[PDB]
Design an enzyme around this catalytic site. Sequence first.
Site, PDB file in Angstrom:
ATOM      1  CD  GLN A 190     -64.478  -3.991 -25.066  1.00 39.00           C
ATOM      2  OE1 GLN A 190     -64.894  -2.870 -25.365  1.00 39.00           O
ATOM      3  NE2 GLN A 190     -64.272  -4.945 -25.965  1.00 39.00           N
TER       4      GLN A 190
ATOM      5  CB  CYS B 151     -66.411  -3.110 -28.237  1.00 40.87           C
ATOM      6  SG  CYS B 151     -66.016  -4.070 -29.697  1.00 40.87           S
TER       7      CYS B 151
ATOM      8  CG  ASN C   8     -63.507   3.079 -25.341  1.00 35.65           C
ATOM      9  OD1 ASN C   8     -64.092   2.143 -25.876  1.00 35.65           O
ATOM     10  ND2 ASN C   8     -62.192   3.253 -25.443  1.00 35.65           N
TER      11      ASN C   8
ATOM     12  CG  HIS D 137     -63.536  -0.075 -30.150  1.00 38.29           C
ATOM     13  ND1 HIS D 137     -63.732  -1.201 -29.376  1.00 38.29           N
ATOM     14  CD2 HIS D 137     -63.495   0.970 -29.287  1.00 38.29           C
ATOM     15  CE1 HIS D 137     -63.819  -0.848 -28.103  1.00 38.29           C
ATOM     16  NE2 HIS D 137     -63.680   0.463 -28.021  1.00 38.29           N
TER      17      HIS D 137
END
EC number: 3.4.22.2
Length: 212
Positions: free
Chosen positions: A19, A25, A175, A159
């Site tokens: 990102q 995110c 992630n 997150h």
Amino acid sequence: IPEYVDWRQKGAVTPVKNQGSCGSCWAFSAVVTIEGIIKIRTGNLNEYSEQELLDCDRRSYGCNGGYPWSALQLVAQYGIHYRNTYPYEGVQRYCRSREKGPYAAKTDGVRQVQPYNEGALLYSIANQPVSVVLEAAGKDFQLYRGGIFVGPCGNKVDHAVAAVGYGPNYILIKNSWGTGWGENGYIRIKRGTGNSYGVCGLYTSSFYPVKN
Ligand SMILES: *[C@@H](C(=O)O)[C@H](O)C(=O)N[C@H](C(=O)NCCCCCCCCN)C1CCC1
């Protein structure tokens, strides 16, 4: 549901993304779940546009953060373009969905996993990748290199990531920090600890799209 799930092995997860500096995110997490449910329902694995959600989700705040639930709602209402059509620029600009032709995929809604419930999250993951949130502010998480992550971390979620599998003592997380973080962009986060919040608050807020 089985002891191990890994949607990467069934071909439902696209390459790990980065990102960048943008607080996007939430859009990356949502897109992971969309790519997954479209693969699960149709057999085709495609990449979809994080940038489109960044620009067009009026309930979110561009690079100042946002809500996976709002992005999945946007995909259930209008649709989403392929990544190639609307690639990631790392900055919020203007909503261009109407200038990029008809949408590429569309879902039918958004169910929420029941929060603070490990089995409920494992159940969803057994059916599809799920958007989840966690506390990523801690250094131990930031510097994670590998292994089954146990923390230390609190439950101040900040997150959005995506759960794409699990094992007897972990949940497998994609992630959006590039392929150089963690285990090629993934983290295995300990589960089964008996803390209702989950390690790093992992059970706070988890959503998945519905597609008939
Ligand atoms: C996630 C990231 O690390 O990039 C990002 O910070 C995020 O979206 N987190 C997210 C969140 O906090 N969303 C709502 C707050 C933003 C309010 C900004 C108001 C500014 C008005 N101009 C949630 C989901 C993960 C935790």
